[PDB]
């Protein structure tokens with residue numbers, strides 16, 4: 001077990017279990033997207049276009065609020081077939097952009113049959129209410145537990161229509177912090193209402209963002 | 225030796241030889257195959273690479289390669305960091321491959337900042353015109369593990385192409401401990417060495433001494449305009 005505070009906090013993760021050794025390495029996430037270590041180049045188109053999510057499972061695992069997806073969605077990227085497994089929340093955001101923090105960051109976790117992991121991160125700023133998020137928050141357990149959502153979700157409405165993104169090689173932001181993770185962070189944020197942010201914080205442990213990590217020898221590539 | 229390119233201490237076993245070699249089995253290892261599929265072209269920092277004449281440099285045969293330790297203090301300024309050249313050595317055949325293509329020789333110029341940041345510049349060599357600088361090195365390079373101090377000066381710049389355009393990615397040392405967080409810079413244009421020079425090098429240096437290419441995993445390679 002680990003947490004975001006105390007002796008089980010981020011600074012002590014690598015010491016909690018032998019399998020968490022990754023947490024202290026050189027290609028960790030999240031990071032601050034710094035212009036100094038960023039280049040601009042044409043990157044592969046990001047084609048998500050998820051299927052409607054029916055009877056998805058909303059889980060409170062003591063670390064975040066996660067939504068497990070039942071349908072088989074395929075994200076074709078660099079010839080690999082990534083399957084969306086779930087998406088979850090972090091408040092405040094884990095990545096920062098030019099030191100700017102967002103009240104919410106959404107992670108859509110995908111994995112290929114052979115284990116390759118690709119996470120799509122979406123920032124959210126306070127603004128207009130997001131219709132999909134209310135469906136999730138209305139049934140999200142305030143304590144560790146799981147609940148099946150009776151309403152369908154249009155996952156595409158939790159992602160900006162404009163798919164321009166930045167990418168870099170990183171890791172999982174929670175123990176074991178495994179590296180070799182392909183990170184894709186959307187440039188444009190979506191919006192959520194103050195009310196939704198308050199509601200999320202009333203049911204999810206927070207703050208639950210890992211401190212930004214050292215960039216080391218990595219370059220961030222921002223697409224067009 | 226603590227590790228080798230063959231046998232029980234070979235590449236696939238490095239990580240299991242010592243706790244300090246755990247890096248060798250991770251996700252951001254070098255060398256790699258430079259494949260267009262995982263590469264983009266962009267505006268990268270200009271590579272200002274020029275070395276001082278190397279005088280009385282030490283040529284060492286450490287059983288893993290032929291390494292030249294220079295006495296001078298050369299600084300490579302990159303991204304606000306000041307990297308000092310520590311030494312350069314050889315690999316045959318090449319460690320990195322370009323679009324599946326292998327070169328007879330790859331030269332590594334290893335630099336490190338004061339705070340431990342490692343930057344290795346790799347230069348490929350294709351068979352062709354003989355390289356005079358290489359001859360000075362080969363003429364004194366120990367055939368058996370040992371060391372020999374050069375009396376002649378070396379112009380390291382003649383082992384580097386005039387065209388400084390390069391490709392870069394985040395990787396590791398290609399030999400144990402295989403530490404990651406290494407900044408790799410591979411020149412696009414190769415230099416040339418005569419077939420005879422390659423034969424001479426293989427007569428004194430352990431070969432093949434190239435580590436198998438590693439999985440690219442979630443990395444991108446960037447080539448500068």
Ligand SMILES: CC(=O)Nc1nnc(S(N)(=O)=O)s1
Nearest residue numbers: 107109119171172173174175
């Ligand atoms: C099984 C699984 O997906 N685990 C994750 N752990 N951290 C993740 S994150 N915050 O990097 O998206 S995903």
Ligand SMILES: CC(=O)Nc1nnc(S(N)(=O)=O)s1
Nearest residue numbers: 332334344396397398399400
């Ligand atoms: C002390 C030192 O420089 N060690 C190195 N180990 N591998 C290197 S390489 N082949 O990646 O240039 S340099």
Ligand SMILES: [Zn+2]
Nearest residue numbers: 088090107173
């Ligand atoms: Zn996450």
Ligand SMILES: [Zn+2]
Nearest residue numbers: 313315332398
């Ligand atoms: Zn080397």
